[PDB]
Amino acid sequence: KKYSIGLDIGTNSVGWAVITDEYKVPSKKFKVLGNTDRHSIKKNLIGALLFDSGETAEATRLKRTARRRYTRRKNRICYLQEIFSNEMAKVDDSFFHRLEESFLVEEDKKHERHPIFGNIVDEVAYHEKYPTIYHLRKKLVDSTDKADLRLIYLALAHMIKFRGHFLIEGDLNPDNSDVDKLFIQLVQTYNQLFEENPINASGVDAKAILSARLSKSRRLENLIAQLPGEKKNGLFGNLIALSLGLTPNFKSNFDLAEDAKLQLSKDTYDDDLDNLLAQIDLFLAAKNLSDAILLSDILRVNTEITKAPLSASMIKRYDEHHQDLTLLKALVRQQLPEKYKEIFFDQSKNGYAGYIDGGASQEEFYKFIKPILEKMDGTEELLVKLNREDLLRKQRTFDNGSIPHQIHLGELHAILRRQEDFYPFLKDNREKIEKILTFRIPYYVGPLARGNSRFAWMTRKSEETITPWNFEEVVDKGASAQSFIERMTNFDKNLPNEKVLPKHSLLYEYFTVYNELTKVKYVTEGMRKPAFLSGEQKKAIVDLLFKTNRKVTVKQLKEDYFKKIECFDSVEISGVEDRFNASLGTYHDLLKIIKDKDFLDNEENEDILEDIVLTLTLFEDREMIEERLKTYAHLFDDKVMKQLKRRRYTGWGRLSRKLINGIRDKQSGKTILDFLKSDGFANRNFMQLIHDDSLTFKEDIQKAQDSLHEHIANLAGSPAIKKGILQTVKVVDELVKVMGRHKPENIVIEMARENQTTQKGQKNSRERMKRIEEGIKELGSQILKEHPVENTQLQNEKLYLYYLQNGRDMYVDQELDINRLSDYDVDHIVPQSFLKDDSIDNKVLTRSDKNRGKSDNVPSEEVVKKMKNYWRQLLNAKLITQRKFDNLTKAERGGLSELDKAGFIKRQLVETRQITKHVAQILDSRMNTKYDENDKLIREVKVITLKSKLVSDFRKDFQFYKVREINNYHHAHDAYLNAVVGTALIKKYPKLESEFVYGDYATAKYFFYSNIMNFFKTEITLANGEIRKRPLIETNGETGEIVWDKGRDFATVRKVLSMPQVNIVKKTEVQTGGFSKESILPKRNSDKLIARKKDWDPKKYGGFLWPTVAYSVLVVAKVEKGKSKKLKSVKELLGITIMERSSFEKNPIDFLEAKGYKEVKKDLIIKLPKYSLFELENGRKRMLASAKQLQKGNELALPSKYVNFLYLASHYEKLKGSPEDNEQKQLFVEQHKHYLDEIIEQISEFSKRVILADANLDKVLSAYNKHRDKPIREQAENIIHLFTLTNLGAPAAFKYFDTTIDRKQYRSTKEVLDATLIHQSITGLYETRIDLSQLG
RNA sequence: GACGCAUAAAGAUGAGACGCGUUUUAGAGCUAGAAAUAGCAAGUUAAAAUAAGGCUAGUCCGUUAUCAACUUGAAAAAGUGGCACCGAGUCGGUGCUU
DNA sequence: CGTTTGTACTCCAGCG
DNA sequence: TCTCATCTTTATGCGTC
DNA sequence: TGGAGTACAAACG
Ligand SMILES: [Mg+2]
Ligand SMILES: [Mg+2]
Ligand SMILES: [Mg+2]
Ligand SMILES: [Mg+2]
Ligand SMILES: [Mg+2]
C-alpha cells in the first residue's frame, strides 16, 4: 500500500513517478469528464510536466528605466519651453506648436508645414546657412550680434536634449583650458616658485605626446628629450602631476614643499594640496593642462581659437565629409563608371547610398568600400583616413558617448553669455537653464513618486512638486539615501526584526576573530592532551598580534606569542592551518587614521565607533558623510575628520548587534561576545552557544521568531524560480490526492549538488591574485611591479580584467589606464542579444568606441587577424582560457551560428539549484507537519536529496542509457530512477539515512559516495582484477529485510523504462509581455500594421507588425460575405492580442461585433491559451501555438533497445569503461547494424501516422538511402537528428549529413475546430474531453 | 541536512544616466522632355514618438510572478474523479464494487 | 468563370 | 555600454549544531 | 519560432 514519489526538477520541466514498495509503477483507471462518450482511461502513474521558463525581471527593468528616462527628457524640454514661452510669444507664437506637430503629414498639420520659420524661403535660407545644428551652435557661441530667439532656443534645446554623460566628476572647464600652449605658463610659474634657476628655454610642447596615444613612456621620453630640467620633479615629477597620476604607495620624490604622496587630479587632490597650500600657484596650472590634454584627446580640435570645440570638431567632420565625397565621386566616375550606381544610388547594398539613406553602418560601409578604394588609383589619403576610421563620418555617430556633459555645458554657457545682453530674460534665468541641463536625480533618491510606486523609497519634506530648482529643498536626501540601503539589506535570521551589522563593524570583526580563536587547540611536549586557549590567553593573543598585524599566520602565532610570552619551546596548533580567516582590518584602518590607540581600545566609546562605521557604510556621498560625522568632530582633530570622510566601506554581515552583544543569559549575564571572549573551560563558539540548552540564548532566539502562492511571494530572489517551485509543489499535491490523499513514504529529490576531491576544490577556488601572478610571471611583464595591487581590490571587474590583459586593450594594440577605467567598457565577446553568458570567458575590457563599433557581433576578421598573436600570448600565459580564445576568434569559424546557439546556458544550473533547494524545504514543511513536544518534529515523510552523480552512475553502469533527443520521456524516467535509487539506498543502509534525508545529520567524503553504490552490482571491480562476488539478494543486514534482488528488480526497472504510455503534459500559458515586436515599419497600404499612437494612421505613418496573441477564442457566429453581401454562419478561432486583451475581457460581445462577427453565441466562447491540446483521428495530437499555427503534440515511444543502441553507436569513443567492456560494446554495435533500418521504419511509421510531413519524410528516406554506406558512428549521430521531425513541440529544422530538411509550419488551425479538446490537470491524469464537433 | 568565517565561480534584484537605431515631416532636386524614362546633381542635420495608454495626476504607472476543466465563492482559495489482477504501441482486457 | 482559401518557399526579429 | 547598491546558489578549507 | 508576404493553383459562387 505504501508508496514513494520521485522528482526530477529542471528549469523548464518537472518529471514525476510513483513507485510502490516493489519498484513497480502503479496504473489506474481515471474518470474522464466532458460530453464525449469515453468514460475512463487507464494511465500509468509516471510522466513529466513541461512549461516555458520563467523570465527574469531584467528585461522589464531595462524597459522601465528607459521609460523613466524618456519621461524625464520630455520634461527637460518642457522646462526650457516654459522658460521661453513669454518671449517667444513676441516673435512667433505658434513656434512650439509647429515643433510639437512636426511629425504629422501636411494635411494633419494645423500650422504651416515648415517648423522653424514658417515659410519656404526662410526655411531654405536657414538650412543653407547652417547645414547642421553644430554650425548654428558654433555660430551662436562665437558671434556677438543679436541672434534670433528661435535659433537660440534650437541650440539650447539640442544641448538640453542630448546632454552627454556624467562620468567625469568635477567641473571640467573648457573655457579655462583646451589651450595646450599653457605649457608656457607652466614653465614660467615653475621658474617663479622654484628658485634654483630652473630650466625655462622649453622646446616642443606636449603636442608631440598628444599626436600619439598618451602614455608614461611617450611623456617621459619627450620631456627628457626636450626639457632636461634641474630636478626630476621639475622636468617629470611636476608635469606628470599635470597629466599623469602616481601608482606607488611610498612618498613622493624629494620634497619641494612637502614630501607627501601625489596623484592625478582626483576628487581628493584639492585636499591633497595640503602639501603646498600650508607650505607655500604652481599647481594651479595643473588643472588647466590636465583638462587641456583630456579635452584634446576627446576632441581633435587644437589649432582653432574657437570657444566651441565640440561644435568645431563636428563642423570639421562635415567639411571633410563634403570634400572626400566630392573626391570619391570624381574618382569613381573617371575610373569605375559601371560601379557608380551601385555605390551612390543602390541603397540595398553597403555603398554610400546604403550608408546614408539605407541601413548600413559605418563599419559595413568601410568594409564594402575598401576593396574599391584599394583597386582604384589616387585614393591614398582615402585609404589612410579609412584605416584611421575617419572617412565620411556622420556628425552623430555611435561613439559620441564619450562627450562629457561639461562640454555641452561650456557651449551653452557661452551662448547665454553672448545673447544675455539682447534678451534680458536669458540673463535672469541663466542659472535655471544651466540647472535644467545639468540636473540629475541621485541614484539613491529613486523615482520621485508620491506613494503610488512599488519601486520608490524617496521621502519628501513637503508636497510641493519637484523641479530641478527646488529638488534640494523638497527631497529629504539624507533619509532617502539611508532608505536606499535599508530597503535592500537582509534582516538577522535568528532575530527577524533586527537589521544586520555592517560587515566592517568593530563588533562584527571582534565576533569573527574571537569565534575563530576560541576553538583553536595547542599542544606541546609537556602537555598530555591539547587544550583550548584560556580567556587570558585569548586576550593576550588579540592585544599582541591581532591588533598589530592585519593578518595572523600560524607561524606568527607560534613564534611571537608561544615562544616569547609564556615561553613554550615548540608547539602544535590545531584549528587553523596556515592563516587565520579572521582579521581586525577595520581596527587597523581606524588606527591608521585615529592615531589614538587608546580611543579604539576604550570600551565606553564603542557605540561612537560603531556609529562611525555604520555611517561610512550607509552613505557614500562626501557631503552626506560630513553632515553625519559633524557631531563627532569634538572627539577628533580636523585632519582626522578630513581623513575619516575618505573611509569608504561596503557590505553587510549576517548577524545583528542585538544577537551578538545585546541579549544576555539570565543566569550569567554574559552576552554571546562575552562567552566567546572568555567561557572558562568549555570555550563554546557561536553555533554551540545559540544551541546550548542550559543557556537562555536558545529560547530567546526561539521565541523571537496564507496560501503557498503568498509564501512564494514572500521569499526573495529572482521571479524565475517561483514558477518551477510552484509547479512542482502542485504536482506533488496532485499525486498525493490521486493516491487516496495518503502521504507518500519517501519523496526523492534529485539535487544538483556535487562532491569534489579536496585537491580539485582547492584548485578551482584559488585566489584571483594568484591567477594573475602566475600568468604575469609566465609572460614576463612588469605590470605588478609598476602597479602594486591586493586581492581585495581585484573584486572590481574592470580592474581584474585590466590585470588579466597585462594592461592592454584586447581589440587594439594600445595601453589601458588604471586611473581612467570608467572610460572603458566591459565588452561581451559573444553579444548579449545572442547568448546569455556573463562569465569571464565572455567579458573583455576595451575602449568604448571599439566596443560600440563592434555592435552585437563577435570581433571582426580584421580585428582577429591583428590581435590573434596577442591573444595566443595571453592563452600561453593562461590568463585567458581556451573558451575565451574560442569566443574571441569565432569569426574565423563562421561567426555566429545556430549550432553555437544550441546549448544549456550557465544560468539554468543556478536556477535549478535554487528551485530544488526551496522545493525540498517547502515539501518537508508541508508533509512533515505533525509536531511533538518530546521530539520537535515527527518525520512522517522522508524527503531524500540524492545527488545527480548517483543516478548518472546507475544509468551508466546498468546500461539504462539516456538520450535526450528522442522524446521527453527521459524526465519521467529520471524521476523513476531517482525514486528507485533513493528508496533502495534508504532501505539498504538505514544508519546512513541521516545523510540523505533532509534535516538529519572532502576526498574521504567523495570516496564514500562512490563506494556506497556498490551493492547494486553483482561483481565489484578492483584495479588488480580482484572481484567481490556480491550475492544476488541484498538484505538490510541488522533486520534481514530484503531490499534489492538483482534477479528481478533490474527486470522491473527495464520493463518500466519501456512503458509506452507516459503522461507528458505541456502547461497551457496565456501569453503576457510586449504588445508586439519593437521594429517600427514604414507606411504601407496594409491593415496588418498597428498604429503606434492613437492619432497616427499606420497607412500614413507606419507602425508595428508582429502582434503577440494572448489567447485564442472559439467563436461560433455569422459573418457577412459573398459577391452580394450575406451573413453566413461560421466557426473559427480569433486571436485576442495583448493590446486588446483588456478590451475583449471588458465586453466580449461588443468586441466581437466590432470585429464583424454577428450573433455570437456568448455561451460558446472558449478561452484557448497557448498549447491547448486537441486530439484528431489516429491519435494525432496538435497543440495550439496561436490562432493560425498548430504545434505537433505526439510523442514517439522508441524501444529501449534502440535507445541504448543509439547511445552506444554514438559516443563511440567516449564510453569511459574498461577496455574489454568498450571492445565488447563495439562488437555489439557491429552485430546490430539492422537497428538502423528498424529505427527508420519506426520513425517513418510515426511520421505517416501523426506528423504528416510527407515531403520531409521523403527527403529523409532518400538521404538515409543515399548515405547508408557511411560509417555506423556517423549514421547514428545523424539519425539522432531525425528525431527533430518527431519531437513534441514546434515544427523545426534539422540535417542529415548534408541534406538540410526545412520546417513545415502547420499554418492551418481549422482541422482542430472539429476535434476533441483535452483539459489536462497538472499531472495529466485528470482529463476533460470536449468534442468540438458537437458545438453548433 | 543546516550555520559563521575565508577563498572562488556562476547568477540575481532595484536605482540613476549616456550613445545610437527606427518611423513621419522639414531641408524647393535640375534638364531635355508628350514622356513612359534617362541623364546630371544632391546626401552628413533637425523636430516629434519610442510599448497603444492609464488615474490616485506623480518629473508616477504600463513587457517579471500569478492561470487545466467543472461545482462553489464579490474574490483569494477550497472542494469533486471506485479496486485488484492479467497484460501492453501512447494504454487494453477481465473480475470486483456504488 | 472569379476568387480564396489553401500549400511552398523565404524571410522577418532594436542595440551598445 | 557607464555609475551605485544589496542579495542568492554551489565548490573547497577552518569551527560547530 | 510565430508572423508576413509573394506566388501559385486547386476549389467553390
Ligand atoms: Mg535531473
Ligand atoms: Mg559589445
Ligand atoms: Mg530533466
Ligand atoms: Mg508571464
Ligand atoms: Mg551547501
Numbering used by the authors: 3 to 282, 288 to 712, 718 to 1013, 1032 to 1366
The authors write:
CRISPR-Cas9 is a powerful tool for genome editing, but the strict requirement for an NGG protospacer-adjacent motif (PAM) sequence immediately next to the DNA target limits the number of editable genes. Recently developed Cas9 variants have been engineered with relaxed PAM requirements, including SpG-Cas9 (SpG) and the nearly PAM-less SpRY-Cas9 (SpRY). Here, we combine structural and biochemical approaches to determine how SpRY interrogates DNA and recognizes target sites. Here, we show that SpRY binds diverse PAM sequences by forming non-specific interactions with the phosphodiester backbone of the target DNA.
Having established the molecular framework of DNA targeting by SpRY, we then aimed to elucidate the mechanisms governing the behavior of its precursor, SpG-Cas9, which has an NGN PAM preference. Since SpRY and SpG share six mutations (D1335L, S1136W, G1218K, E1219Q, R1335Q, and T1337R), we hypothesized that SpG may be a potential intermediate between Cas9 and SpRY in terms of PAM promiscuity and DNA cleavage efficiency. While SpRY loses all PAM specificity, SpG retains specificity for guanine at position 2 of the PAM through residue R1333. To probe whether SpG and SpRY operate through analogous mechanisms of engaging diverse PAM sequences, we determined the structures of SpG bound to NGG and NGC PAM-containing DNA substrates with global resolutions of 3.1 Å and 3.6 Å, respectively. Through structural analysis of SpG, we uncovered that four mutations (D1135L, S1136W, E1219Q, and T1337Q) engender DNA duplex interactions mirroring those delineated for SpRY. Intriguingly, the mutations G1218K and R1335Q, which adopt different rotamers for different PAM sequences in SpRY, maintain the same rotamer conformation in the context of SpG. This observation raises the possibility that R1333 in SpG is pre-ordered and poised for rapid PAM recognition similar to Cas9. Therefore, SpG recognizes DNA targets through a hybrid mechanism of base-specific and non-specific electrostatic contacts that resemble both Cas9 and SpRY. Our structural analysis of SpG revealed that it engages diverse NGN PAM sequences through a hybrid mechanism combining base-specific and electrostatic contacts.
